[PDB]
Design an enzyme around this catalytic site. Structure first.
Site, PDB file in Angstrom:
ATOM      1  CE  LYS A 172     -42.767   8.039 -19.423  1.00 19.75           C
ATOM      2  NZ  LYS A 172     -43.101   7.888 -17.982  1.00 19.75           N
ATOM      3  NE  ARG A 173     -47.007  -1.271 -23.458  1.00 17.90           N
ATOM      4  CZ  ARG A 173     -47.899  -2.255 -23.552  1.00 17.90           C
ATOM      5  NH1 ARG A 173     -47.994  -3.163 -22.592  1.00 17.90           N
ATOM      6  NH2 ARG A 173     -48.708  -2.324 -24.599  1.00 17.90           N
ATOM      7  CE  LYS A 195     -47.557   5.358 -20.570  1.00 20.68           C
ATOM      8  NZ  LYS A 195     -47.473   5.655 -19.109  1.00 20.68           N
TER       9      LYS A 195
HETATM   10  C1  PLP Z   1     -42.806   1.054 -13.027  1.00 24.64           C
HETATM   11  C2  PLP Z   1     -42.971   0.505 -14.450  1.00 24.64           C
HETATM   12  C3  PLP Z   1     -43.856   1.075 -15.345  1.00 24.64           C
HETATM   13  C4  PLP Z   1     -44.600   2.379 -15.050  1.00 24.64           C
HETATM   14  O1  PLP Z   1     -43.968   3.450 -15.746  1.00 24.64           O
HETATM   15  P1  PLP Z   1     -44.704   4.901 -15.886  1.00 24.64           P
HETATM   16  O2  PLP Z   1     -43.665   5.775 -16.439  1.00 24.64           O
HETATM   17  O3  PLP Z   1     -45.316   5.253 -14.611  1.00 24.64           O
HETATM   18  O4  PLP Z   1     -45.886   4.619 -16.948  1.00 24.64           O
HETATM   19  C5  PLP Z   1     -43.977   0.559 -16.609  1.00 24.64           C
HETATM   20  N1  PLP Z   1     -43.242  -0.496 -17.004  1.00 24.64           N
HETATM   21  C6  PLP Z   1     -42.358  -1.081 -16.161  1.00 24.64           C
HETATM   22  C7  PLP Z   1     -41.532  -2.245 -16.705  1.00 24.64           C
HETATM   23  C8  PLP Z   1     -42.205  -0.589 -14.868  1.00 24.64           C
HETATM   24  O5  PLP Z   1     -41.229  -1.134 -14.011  1.00 24.64           O
HETATM   25  O1  GLC Z   2     -51.873   3.322 -10.975  1.00 17.70           O
HETATM   26  C1  GLC Z   2     -50.977   2.553 -11.738  1.00 17.70           C
HETATM   27  C2  GLC Z   2     -50.897   3.089 -13.174  1.00 17.70           C
HETATM   28  O2  GLC Z   2     -52.104   2.793 -13.924  1.00 17.70           O
HETATM   29  C3  GLC Z   2     -52.087   3.164 -15.335  1.00 17.70           C
HETATM   30  O3  GLC Z   2     -50.960   2.544 -15.949  1.00 17.70           O
HETATM   31  C4  GLC Z   2     -51.886   4.694 -15.474  1.00 17.70           C
HETATM   32  O4  GLC Z   2     -51.567   4.957 -16.842  1.00 17.70           O
HETATM   33  C5  GLC Z   2     -50.700   5.189 -14.582  1.00 17.70           C
HETATM   34  O5  GLC Z   2     -50.679   6.586 -14.480  1.00 17.70           O
HETATM   35  C6  GLC Z   2     -50.757   4.621 -13.141  1.00 17.70           C
HETATM   36  O6  GLC Z   2     -49.587   4.954 -12.443  1.00 17.70           O
END
Ligand code: PLP
Ligand code: GLC
Ligand code: CPB
Ligand code: CPB
Ligand code: PLP
Ligand code: GLC
Ligand code: PO3
Ligand code: PO3
EC number: 2.4.1.1
Lengths: 813, 813
Positions: free
Chosen positions: A543-544, A549
């Site tokens: 994730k970012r 986080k």
């Molecule tokens: C689905 C997705 C996210 C969302 O990740 P979270 O753990 O919910 O913040 C972020 N980056 C990419 C490339 C994704 O496919």
């Molecule tokens: O709703 C889509 C996304 O928006 C933002 O990235 C929030 O950080 C994440 O929690 C959420 O899932």
């Protein structure tokens, strides 16, 4: 004759009945007549393009029939305005949703080509930062599958989210030239370009307000088709590109200044940067989008909300409220009250975060000079809105100051979220816990004024790309017991609970995860010459990079695992390959320091002979949608450790669950609902809950208390401070240490003990493959609630007032 | 199997045998699957594109077979480097050269469409200023028709020559967004992008010179097919586009600085402006072009000149000489002498003007910092070249200073023409008189040193676009007596001399001119609401505005015609519609003043009731290739009045001759050879000859002498000075008057009397339609020498060492 002759111009017959002989014929045609190549100079890339174009024909055929169908039926249309759409790859998705996969595989095979090699030529369309942008993309896929007349509107950035390179263990940014070789899926529409105005001033003539002396920037739309799953419905994603309107040389060169608006996507995730270029981008997409909408509506306004629904993806396109008012009052000359009515009934706002530094507050001085008329319209909306608050709570002047769209201070600012709430008939959170937090915290006042406006719409992911596409093996072993109906009715995975004790299913689930893990290890070695033991627990956090986080919390556990193996070198521990990936906003110091610490830790751990293959720390460079489709299906443990109350919902968590991984996380965002669906006994919940975080904030968070009381924690900090992970530069991580000890808003120390203990429970269950596998089955089988089909169905019924449908349209011919 | 299966990938069968049923089928496919449209929203523009794409398939099919044929045969390849290629429209040209016209007409007709309406949707590809750029385009058409393996190399400007708007009688410039709707003929080739270096420095290691620390700019090629006439040969025109190589936001935005190189075409015609951006453009096209050439040659260098010919279109791509040396010496590590040998034997230079202010002299300070290594290589070439001069003329130090590639002075400069002569095995003028002037004036010294290098290659125009295309009526009445062989063997028009006394032919020639004149008048009224009497002598002067081209001389005659009608209001005079068109370089004051005078004159003449329809002055706004194809076929009298010795050759003059217009001109450029071919008795030659101009320069040009001796001239000047043509601003033309009286380098007064008298002779002959028509026939019948096929045949045989061929390749299938 004459006009009657043009009736011959029809989509009537297209590139084929959807079978091998014709597919091969078109592949050949496109290779020569579209790419201007021949079999002697053609490279795999040329061959991928030939297949992409061949497949696009089938898509377009339906694209045309769908739009024709909408014009005839005239259903209420739904417009999803977002500054981001993280689409990823399109070839396979299209083949799957259209059921062309098998035929295309055979056709290419017969032509002496390998389709999988071809499919891998395609890179992501990364016009998004992460969660918010990818949610929009999943939503687009779902609305098409649910037969809704929806359109995605955004900006066509020349450069999407930067590509991440790791140099000397640090993140380096490289522009993402995603259009270098072209984009076969989009279709430019210069004939539909519209003008957008900036700056200027407002004069008040005898018959209304006029926005004059403005600078013009054209908005040229580029249409992309989005195919629903096997229903023959193809919706549109229209993205705007900036163009300059039409000495001498310098004047022509300066045309670049206007086209800079759609040049690059701001690489910030969950953070507001008040840059004028960003504000221009937000109004750019809004101004052009609303023109296109009112135009499409015309080809009086009392029925506008009956035929139009505008969904605001965060506050980014919030200017849509004052713009729609501007158009209705200033141009269509509707009286204020009637215009407003139409406006609120048309718009709805979705909130995605509670963190203050992500919320948009534009200085008025920036708004008055860039969009004077909009600042005027906003003040008027404010006065009228506050008048209503004053009327509902007489004497409560404090509440007036708190709910005002205007924030006073040295620097006057417009709170865009308040604007969205005022001009929207519905406001919604993206997870139950998030939606409740909004009602009792940041939006408590508004909720009290208009309780009816607040809703919840728990996020979701599309089972197409996030299961059928990225995990074909899992999709097939599942399909062999319950069929394929679950693909567009995920709640059917519930049937799998009937196989929790079936030896064949348990065997297949574990074998597919192992094949995926084996495949991922071969991908890492191949492209990054990185080795990982496939017979180890794949611990993954992608994730970012964010302090909230808490990748850092994960770091503390890794070093804890390392120290424990060094303390008792010959004691057995379940082998682990900890994977952390994600990008840091370029200007986010702590985030970049966190990335360096991760690699720095891997540098020590990965080369310690005593540790060997019992523990491996790997930083997955350039995490993106395409990589997510790779690593997630090979994961065993999904990390979702954000501080309770900071992650609105999360979607990665959902991706892992649907793909056979067990979750270790806090009671945050959607983690709460996933545990509720699978049962907490099948989950690994730990740490403080929202209440525990709040109580600590009341008395005060003192990280030194945990430092003094947890020996293992002290040791880790002493190692970081010592230069143990940076011998050539001993004080390199001093910023991370001091933050954790004296300024950690996310309480990493407060969750450390429960985190490590919970991680002990994970290794415990993994030592028992059969039981681990069985728990996984209970997860996969209860992930149905997180299908984006479910989320869109609710938006449709509770917000947009449109009924979802699985009715399929007839094939083009 | 495997690789053998790819043999199915073949151009084998294409979009059709070249007939109606299949054409209609593809038109339908492209309308839906390429444009993503349907018959309900399709506009004429969408329909034009559908036809263009349909026709392009037939072109590509041959494009592929031609290149395959060249790779197999491996003929010496010819590269025509030009900074300009004024191509114009492509749809009709392609249909004609491929013989698709009739079938496409029928197919569209059957689909309920009008092809001519469709063809008119297409605008010019104006990547040129005028004569030089259009010569290159005619050359491309001819080399393809002559079966030569030639490639046109240039720059793909985002904006071509500006569009001219006339506001308040003045020229206004508007960027020419020629790519707004896309370009269906080009094919981007990102996979072939090459790097170009700028700035940096040179260090001298133990094994040679190294150009390091440079800035890189990528050059991405865009290929355009050029079809020969009915031989199934399609050559390529490859144009380079600039791309940037691969805080953060600003860094991405700054990528625009590198792509500015191919942004706009410098709008100067016959004038040098030492701008760094222009120099970057010249090296940009050169660096990338030579890489592509050496690469194509590789897939040692003694045979380079045997397989490669590089023709320099003026001094613009002259950097090709030091670049080729740089590559051979610095990269391929050839010894200097051998490299040079290869270089001279590969290159050849074509000169297009004698005027000093058009010749390129780049300050060395600009060259040392932008292309250090090239400045070094140039000095070395200079030293070695001068050493040869010193050896051939001992003691003649003055000649050394005159022939040096380096000009000394406050500002050191590099004379690019001298560079071209030194590094070229052949130098050529573009008209007999021009080529002789070069040998006895500006290049006398070089001619004396190497007489063998100097040649002549009289310009020419392609009879395809300039007769068959723009004048179908003339092309058919001609075809009905002598056939169609003349189309690619123009010397066959000589057969028409056998019909100079045939009543049917005389009737047809006059009827076609009248239909064209009638058609042009309907075009002017339609788009510009401008009325012109079709029963009047169409006096036309269209070319860029220049003092040397003397549009002003034409102006003096117009006012003379006006004054004469006012003096004797009831005396009869042959009705005239004088047309002057052309653009002025944005920074050319006098040229812009000349345009205003023309409209200013029309303002008075066109509204004087006494004059009525006996005389009409019209300024043809935005003169361009597409307009030339319109007005030229409707012309009766062609103005070619440049001062003797200033117009190297001219090509417009040739266009008029082939189209049925009589010429009034000076003995300048190719006017000399056209008169020689048709016979001076069938021409209207007047004014000073080169010798008369030179003698006047010896004694001194005093315009006051003509002013004092010519009453009618005095009156005109008094009118201009008086404010007679600018009542609201009496002194508006003071700049034009003073120039003519005290600083006229082009002696307009010196040719006035002979000019007016010659114009009297024109009206005299026009009063006799039969005799006028017969003289025209003698012109049209003797225009064959001016076919670009003739010019390219000579270049091929006398310079490139390749034999022209009319052998046709087999159709794709
Ligand atoms: C689905 C997705 C996210 C969302 O990740 P979270 O753990 O919910 O913040 C972020 N980056 C990419 C490339 C994704 O496919
Ligand atoms: O709703 C889509 C996304 O928006 C933002 O990235 C929030 O950080 C994440 O929690 C959420 O899932
Ligand atoms: C005090 N200071 C700390 C850094 C912060 C900052 C930057 O200076 C630059 C950035 O790119 C970011 C970013 O991407 C995310 C967050 C962020 C977002 C949510 C919660 C907490 C934080 Cl720290 O903060 C950023 C801002 O200047 C305030
Ligand atoms: C003295 N001065 C006069 C104007 C001239 C000039 C400009 O300042 C600007 C221009 O755009 C042009 C142009 O396009 C052509 C010619 C030209 C070309 C050939 C022969 C004679 C002339 Cl005048 O001259 C130009 C230059 O500054 C020298
Ligand atoms: C042929 C052509 C020219 C050349 O005209 P000259 O009279 O030779 O200078 C210039 N402009 C256009 C548009 C042309 O077609
Ligand atoms: O050679 C092509 C053309 O080049 C320049 O435009 C000259 O002015 C012109 O005389 C010549 O015809
Ligand atoms: P056709 O008119 O598209 O079926
Ligand atoms: P084919 O192999 O192109 O004819």
């Amino acid at each position: 004759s004459d006009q009657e002759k043009r009736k011959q111009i029809s989509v009537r017959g297209l590139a084929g009945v959807e079978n091998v002989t014709e597919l091969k014929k078109n592949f050949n045609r496109h290779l020569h007549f579209t790419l201007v190549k021949d079999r002697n100079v053609a490279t795999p890339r040329d061959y991928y393009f030939a297949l992409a174009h061949t497949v696009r024909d089938h898509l377009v055929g339906r694209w045309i029939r769908t739009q024709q169908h909408y014009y005839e039926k005239d259903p209420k249309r739904i417009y999803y305005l977002s500054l981001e759409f993280y689409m990823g790859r399109t070839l396979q998705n299209t083949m799957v949703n259209l059921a062309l996969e098998n035929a295309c595989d055979e056709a290419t095979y017969q032509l002496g080509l390998d389709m999988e090699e071809l499919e891998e030529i395609e890179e992501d369309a990364g016009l998004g930062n992460g969660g918010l942008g990818r949610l929009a993309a999943c939503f687009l896929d779902s609305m098409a599958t649910l037969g809704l007349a929806a359109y995605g509107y955004g900006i066509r950035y020349e450069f999407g989210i930067f590509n991440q390179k790791i140099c000397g263990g640090w993140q380096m940014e490289e522009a993402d030239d995603w259009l270098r070789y072209g984009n076969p899926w989009e279709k430019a529409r210069p004939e539909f370009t519209l003008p957008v105005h900036f700056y200027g001033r407002v004069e008040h003539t005898s018959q209304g307000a006029k926005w004059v002396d403005t600078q013009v920037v054209l908005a040229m739309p580029y249409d992309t088709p989005v195919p629903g799953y096997r229903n023959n419905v193809v919706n549109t994603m229209r993205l705007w590109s900036a163009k300059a309107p039409n000495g001498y040389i310098q004047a022509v060169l300066d045309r670049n200044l206007a086209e800079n608006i759609s040049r690059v996507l701001y690489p910030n995730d969950n953070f507001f940067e008040g840059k004028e270029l960003r504000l221009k981008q937000e109004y750019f997409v809004v101004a052009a989008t609303l023109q296109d909408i009112i135009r499409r509506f015309k080809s009086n306004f009392d029925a506008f909300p009956d035929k139009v629904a505008i969904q605001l993806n965060d506050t980014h396109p919030s200017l849509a409220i004052p713009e729609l008012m501007r158009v209705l009052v200033d141009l269509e000359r509707l009286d204020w009250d009637k215009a407003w009515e139409v406006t609120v009934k048309t718009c709805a706002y979705t909130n995605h975060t509670v963190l203050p530094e992500a919320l948009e507050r534009w200085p008025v001085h920036l708004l008055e000079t860039l969009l004077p008329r909009h600042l005027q319209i906003i003040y008027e909306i404010n006065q009228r809105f506050l008048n209503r608050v004053a009327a509902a709570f007489p004497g409560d002047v404090d509440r007036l100051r708190r709910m005002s769209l205007v924030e006073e201070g040295a620097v006057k600012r417009i709170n865009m979220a308040h604007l969205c709430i005022a001009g929207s008939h519905a406001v919604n959170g993206v997870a139950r816990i998030h939606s409740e937090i909004l009602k009792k915290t940041i939006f408590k006042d508004f909720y009290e004024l208009e309780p009816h406006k607040f809703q919840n719409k728990t996020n979701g992911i599309t089972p197409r790309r996030w299961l059928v596409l990225c995990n074909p093996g899992l999709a097939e072993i599942i399909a062999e017991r319950i069929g394929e109906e679950y693909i567009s009715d995920l709640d059917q995975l519930r049937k799998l609970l009937s196989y929790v004790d079936d030896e064949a299913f348990i065997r297949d689930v574990a074998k597919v995860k192992q094949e995926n893990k084996l495949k991922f290890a071969a991908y890492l070695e191949r492209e990054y010459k990185v080795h990982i033991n496939p017979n180890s627990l794949f611990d993954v956090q992608v994730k970012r990079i964010h302090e909230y986080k808490r990748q850092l919390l994960n770091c503390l556990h890794v070093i804890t695992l390392y120290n424990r193996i060094k303390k008792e070198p010959n004691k057995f521990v379940v082998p682990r390959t900890v994977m952390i990936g994600g990008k840091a906003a370029p200007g986010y110091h702590m985030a970049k320091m966190i990335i360096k610490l991760i690699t720095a830790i891997g540098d020590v751990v990965n080369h310690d002979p005593v540790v060997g293959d019992r523990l491996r720390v790997i930083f997955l460079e350039n995490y993106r949608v395409s990589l997510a489709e790779k690593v997630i299906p090979a994961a065993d443990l999904s990390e979702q450790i954000s501080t309770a109350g900071t992650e609105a919902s999360g979607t990665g968590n959902m991706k892992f669950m649907l793909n056979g991984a067990l979750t270790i996380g806090t009671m945050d965002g959607a983690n709460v609902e996933m545990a509720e669906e699978a049962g907490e006994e099948n989950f690994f919940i730990f740490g403080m809950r929202v209440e525990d975080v709040d109580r600590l904030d009341q008395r005060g968070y003192n990280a030194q208390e945990y430092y003094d009381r947890i020996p293992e924690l002290r040791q880790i900090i002493e190692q970081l401070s010592s230069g143990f992970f940076s011998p050539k530069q001993p004080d390199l991580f001093k910023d991370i240490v001091n933050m954790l000890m004296h300024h950690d808003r996310f309480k990493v120390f407060a969750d450390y003990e429960e985190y490590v203990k919970c991680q002990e429970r994970v290794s415990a269950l993994y030592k028992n493959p059969r039981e681990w596998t069985r728990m996984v089955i209970r997860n996969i089988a209860t992930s149905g609630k997180f299908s984006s089909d479910r989320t869109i169905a609710q938006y449709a019924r509770e917000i947009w007032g449109v009924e979802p449908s699985r009715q399929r349209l007839p094939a083009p011919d």
